[PDB]
Amino acid sequence: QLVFRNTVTGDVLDLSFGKKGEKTEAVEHFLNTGENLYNTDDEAIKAGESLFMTACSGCHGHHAEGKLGPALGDDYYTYPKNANDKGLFETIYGGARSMMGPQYNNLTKDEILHIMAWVRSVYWGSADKADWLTEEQKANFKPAEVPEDFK
Amino acid sequence: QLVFRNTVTGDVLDLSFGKKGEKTEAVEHFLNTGENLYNTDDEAIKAGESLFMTACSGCHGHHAEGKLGPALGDDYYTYPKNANDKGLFETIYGGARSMMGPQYNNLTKDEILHIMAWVRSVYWGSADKADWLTEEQKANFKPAEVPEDF
Amino acid sequence: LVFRNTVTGDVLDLGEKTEAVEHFLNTGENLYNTDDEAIKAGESLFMTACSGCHGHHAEGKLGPALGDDYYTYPKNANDKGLFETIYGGARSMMGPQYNNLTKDEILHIMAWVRSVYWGSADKADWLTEEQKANFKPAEVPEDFK
Amino acid sequence: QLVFRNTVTGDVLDLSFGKKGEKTEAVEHFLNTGENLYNTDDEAIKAGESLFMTACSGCHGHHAEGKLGPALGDDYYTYPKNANDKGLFETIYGGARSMMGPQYNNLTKDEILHIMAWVRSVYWGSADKADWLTEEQKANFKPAEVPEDFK
Ligand code: HEC
Ligand code: HEC
Ligand code: HEC
Ligand code: HEC
Ligand SMILES: [Ca+2]
Ligand SMILES: [Ca+2]
Ligand SMILES: [Ca+2]
Ligand SMILES: [Ca+2]
Ligand SMILES: [Fe+3]
Ligand SMILES: [Fe+3]
Ligand SMILES: [Fe+3]
Ligand SMILES: [Fe+3]
Ligand code: NA
Ligand code: NA
Ligand code: NA
Ligand code: NA
Ligand code: NA
Ligand code: NA
Ligand code: NA
Ligand code: NA
């Protein structure tokens, strides 16, 4: 019985709100466990890259290096819960401050998990701060390519 | 095909960018004529509403009333060529200045024509400044409700 | 003169007023546009209040470039309009300045903003026709085109 | 030796340019020790308030609650060195990422210390995490109220 909460207000997120897609295995798994099955799925990561460019790149940069909103590929966080997949989904679904609007009406839950897998795949921060990774994944993790513009 | 120019630099746009698919009838007609077939197709306009909310509403508002970027439903334009569909397409595809980046990597040319059709559908400006409309359309054009957001 | 919000069109509520502020409230004309000392002071206030969002050379960053002849709001090509936009704010991040800055400080900023203009004389609606005829555009910032 | 380093790059900060202003007691003392004399000066806190509204509120909110940039009054920091006065000065002076540009051309070093004193005055986090406070101040610490806009 997971309690999903708004990143800014702490209000409960009603996950039945917003754009309905097919009720996929990744979404049912996520609603039960806060684990994103697409983190390891190369096909899903590819589809997440394309959804991030459409929905996110204008504010976060085509390499998640940050532009108007922050870098999403680094181990620095505005909200520390965004280091884990339950928090990241909450921030995307429910929105945060200012121009970071909720995406519940723009994207299905399955599309958000695709985008989330892609955001994790381009990570260039330290394994020690990667809360979404298992101890096994950390031990075997190489930081991805830093974007130039991250300085 | 016509020559499509970048709104900021005046340089020619590469419309062949990407490998998402082959041109739709609407896209091939638009590249030849600058006319957007979706402007009068209610189904195309609804798909464009959803595409606009996902790609554009963060910076231009959920009613195209403006937020970080300008209102798109009014009859003033920062770039007056955006009152016609050729200009509008060039601005979206190629980008403009500051936070208005090019969309050629975010959206297919067909999705952009879907978005443009929805943007024209919500216009609340005068018929006389609506350069994308035909005289038949201008005679029967009634402005959309001005959103209370703006 | 009646002063209106750039976005809503609502009245702006506008004392120990300077000559420039009294002249501005009666005419919509900014005396500081030709006062080199006032343009220097406006540079320092612009860097404090504006450069974070509009850049150190008014080239644009969060908000638009202010030195070019493209406007989001066409009235910002005249000093009455520009004053309304700064005083009363616009959309999103462009908040009202009426509590942060005096009217006199705003006129200093506006004088500096006009001093770094790099667009066309034709679109410079704050210049008289004789100022246009003797127009000397400022350098175009490297981070703009 | 007290060396000031850029929050993003780690490069030594050059303090000889920007808005020169005047060498003040508070600035000389801070460049020698990393201690902000303005922190306990109610007159300086009031001046810092007006400088923050003019220079900072557009991105950080009128109550330092966050808007486009982070909340500054809470006890979570994107960059944990900002919990001390040396780190906070470095981030303000030399900037951070995305839209947090350097402020050394916008403000004198003295103006920055005024803003910093005001930011510490509105702090609503825990005494345990307020590194800039002496242990007298921390044993006597009363956090400011949480502004509504923080949510
Ligand atoms: C501009 C209109 C934006 C779009 C589109 C998206 N984001 Fe965003 N985001 C933006 C800002 C201005 C901020 C800071 C807001 C705040 O409350 O401080 C954000 C924040 C995020 C975060 C938090 C990051 C952290 O360090 O904690 C995440 C994870 C984030 N945004 C993700 C994200 C994704 C995946 C988007 C596409 C669906 C997306 N954002 C769109 C501005 C904008
Ligand atoms: C924030 C990251 C933005 C996103 C996402 C989109 N737009 Fe935008 N747009 C933005 C700004 C800051 C500006 C002004 C730029 C300038 O050079 O003045 C714009 C401008 C436009 C225009 C020009 C309108 C005019 O008056 O001439 C159009 C037609 C426009 N934008 C459309 C648009 C569409 C359809 C988007 C989704 C695909 C979109 N923009 C995204 C900021 C942002
Ligand atoms: C970030 C928090 C900002 C600060 C501080 C200032 N401005 Fe701004 N400005 C900003 C945005 C995001 C926009 C677009 C808003 C909109 O409603 O479309 C603006 C807009 C302006 C304009 C309009 C320009 C036009 O082309 O019509 C002007 C003249 C303007 N801003 C001036 C300005 C001055 C002088 C400031 C210091 C007092 C200032 N702005 C601060 C974002 C931000
Ligand atoms: C908008 C153009 C901004 C203005 C004006 C100011 N700040 Fe800012 N700040 C902004 C963003 C987008 C961020 C996040 C940057 C990042 O690298 O993550 C910041 C960050 C800060 C911080 C870091 C806080 C932390 O948790 O570590 C501080 C201390 C900070 N900003 C202070 C600050 C002050 C005092 C300002 C007025 C002089 C100021 N900022 C202006 C965006 C913007
Ligand atoms: Ca958190
Ligand atoms: Ca034009
Ligand atoms: Ca106007
Ligand atoms: Ca640190
Ligand atoms: Fe980019
Ligand atoms: Fe809205
Ligand atoms: Fe700059
Ligand atoms: Fe505010
Ligand atoms: Na991060
Ligand atoms: Na970050
Ligand atoms: Na328009
Ligand atoms: Na407009
Ligand atoms: Na302009
Ligand atoms: Na402009
Ligand atoms: Na914070
Ligand atoms: Na903090």
Question: Which residues in chain D have Cβ-Cβ distances shorter than 8 Å to C48?
Answer: 51, 54-55, 106-107
D10, exposed or middle or buried, with CB in 10 Å at 0-12, 13-18, 19+? exposed
Sign of the Cα pseudo-torsion (C121, C127, C132, C137, in order): negative
Which conformational region is residue C114 in: left (phi greater than 0), alpha (psi within -120 to 50 degrees), or beta?
alpha
**Phi–psi pair at C91, nearest 5 degrees:** -90, 165
| Residue A60 marked as a ligand binder | yes
- The pair of three-digit structure tokens given for residue B42, joined into one six-digit string: 């209610």
Are C30 and C131 a contacting pair, CB within 8 Å? no
Q: Among C61, C72, C145, whose Cβ lies nearest the Cβ of B78?
A: C72
Beta-bridged to residue C67, according to DSSP, are none
| Residue C72 marked as a ligand binder | yes
3-state helix, strand, coil in chain D (%, to 5): 45, 0, 55
DSSP code of residue A37? G
> What does the alpha-carbon distance between residue C56 and residue C37 come to, in Å, rounded to a whole number?
19
Closest CA to A35 of A109, A132, A105: A132
Decide whether any atom of ligand 3 lies within 6 Å of the C99 Cβ.
no
Are A14 and A90 a contacting pair, CB within 8 Å? no
Q: Among C7, C70, C144, whose Cβ lies nearest the Cβ of B150?
A: C7
Are C93 and C52 a contacting pair, CB within 8 Å? no
Give the minimum alpha-carbon distance from C62 to chain D in angstroms, rounded to a whole number. Answer: 7
Beta-bridged to residue B12, according to DSSP, are B5
| Contacts of A51 by beta carbon, 8 Å cutoff, 6+ apart | A107, A111, A114, A115, A118
Give the start-to-end residue ranges of the domains of chain D: 1-151
| Residue B84 marked as a ligand binder | no
Ligand nearest, relative to CA of residue B100: 2
DSSP letters of C44-80?
A: HHHHHHTHHHH-TTS--SSS--SSSS--SSGGGGSHH
Give the minimum alpha-carbon distance from D26 to chain A in angstroms, rounded to a whole number. Answer: 31
Q: Nearest residue CA, atom 31 of ligand 1?
A: A100
Single-letter amino acid code for the residue at A57: S
Of all helices (H) and strands (E), which one includes residue B89? helix B85-94
Terminal-to-terminal C-alpha distance of chain B: 38
Beta-bridged to residue A5, according to DSSP, are A12
Beta-bridged to residue C11, according to DSSP, are C4
**Cα–Cα distances in angstroms (integers) from residue C99 to residues A130, B102, C96, D4, in the given order:** 44, 37, 8, 34
The residues in C 30-49 lying below 8 A from D, measured between CB atoms, are: 44, 47-49
Place of tokens 């080199």: C36
- The pair of three-digit structure tokens given for residue A74, joined into one six-digit string: 């680094």
Place of tokens 């007006």: D50
Question: Which residues in chain A have Cβ-Cβ distances shorter than 8 Å to B57?
Answer: 101, 106
DSSP letters of B13-73?
A: P-TT---S-PPPHHHHHHHHHS--GGGG-HHHHHHHHHHHHHHTHHHH-TTSS-SSSPPSS
Ligand 1 atom, smallest distance to A81 CA: 27
Of all helices (H) and strands (E), which one includes residue D114? helix D109-121
Single-letter amino acid code for the residue at D129: K
Q: Hey, is B138 helix, strand or coil?
A: helix
> What does the alpha-carbon distance between residue A43 and residue A31 come to, in Å, rounded to a whole number?
21
Q: Which of C39, C53, C108 to mutate to test the pocket of ligand 3 (most atoms within 8 A of CB)?
A: C53
Q: Hey, how many other C-beta atoms are within 10 angstroms of the C-beta on A99?
A: 20
Single-letter amino acid code for the residue at A21: G
Give the minimum alpha-carbon distance from A150 to chain B in angstroms, rounded to a whole number. Answer: 17
**C71 in B contact zone (CB under 8 Å):** yes
Which conformational region is residue D61 in: left (phi greater than 0), alpha (psi within -120 to 50 degrees), or beta?
left
Question: Which residues in chain D have Cβ-Cβ distances shorter than 8 Å to A80?
Answer: 76
CA of A52 to the centre of ligand 10 (A): 21
CA of C6 to the centre of ligand 7 (A): 6
Question: Which residues in chain A have Cβ-Cβ distances shorter than 8 Å to B68?
Answer: 68, 99
> What does the alpha-carbon distance between residue A113 and residue A89 come to, in Å, rounded to a whole number?
7
Based on its alpha-carbon atoms, the radius of gyration of chain A, rounded to whole angstroms, reads 14
| Contacts of C41 by beta carbon, 8 Å cutoff, 6+ apart | C108
Beta-bridged to residue D5, according to DSSP, are D12
Helices (H), A23-149: 25-33, 42-55, 57-60, 85-94, 109-121, 135-139
- The pair of three-digit structure tokens given for residue B20, joined into one six-digit string: 């998402």
Give the minimum alpha-carbon distance from C12 to chain A in angstroms, rounded to a whole number. Answer: 25
Rounded to the nearest angstrom, the gap between the alpha carbon of residue C65 and the centroid of all alpha carbons in its chain is 12
Are C144 and C60 a contacting pair, CB within 8 Å? yes
> What does the alpha-carbon distance between residue D47 and residue D55 come to, in Å, rounded to a whole number?
12
CA of B26 to the centre of ligand 15 (A): 23
| CA angle (C40 as vertex; C38, C42 as ends), nearest 5 | 70
Question: Which residues in chain A have Cβ-Cβ distances shorter than 8 Å to C60?
Answer: none
Which conformational region is residue D101 in: left (phi greater than 0), alpha (psi within -120 to 50 degrees), or beta?
beta
- The pair of three-digit structure tokens given for residue C132, joined into one six-digit string: 């246009």
Question: Which residues in chain A have Cβ-Cβ distances shorter than 8 Å to C92?
Answer: 99
DSSP letters of D46-74?
A: HHHHHHHHHHTHHHH-TTSS-SSSPPSSS
> What does the alpha-carbon distance between residue A27 and residue A112 come to, in Å, rounded to a whole number?
9
Are A144 and A121 a contacting pair, CB within 8 Å? yes
Q: Which of C32, C66, C94, C115 to mutate to test the pocket of ligand 3 (most atoms within 8 A of CB)?
A: C94
Of all helices (H) and strands (E), which one includes residue D28? helix D25-33
Q: Nearest residue CA, atom 32 of ligand 3?
A: C86
Give the minimum alpha-carbon distance from D99 to chain A in angstroms, rounded to a whole number. Answer: 6
Are A116 and A123 a contacting pair, CB within 8 Å? no
> What does the alpha-carbon distance between residue D52 and residue C113 come to, in Å, rounded to a whole number?
22
Beta-bridged to residue A12, according to DSSP, are A5
Q: Among C64, C73, C91, whose Cβ lies nearest the Cβ of B97?
A: C64
The neighbourhood of ligand 5, an ion, using CB within 5 A, equals A 79-81
DSSP code of residue D12? B
The residues in B 78-107 lying below 8 A from A, measured between CB atoms, are: 99, 101, 105-107
Rounded to the nearest angstrom, the gap between the alpha carbon of residue A121 and the centroid of all alpha carbons in its chain is 10
**D19 in C contact zone (CB under 8 Å):** yes
| Residue A38 marked as a ligand binder | no
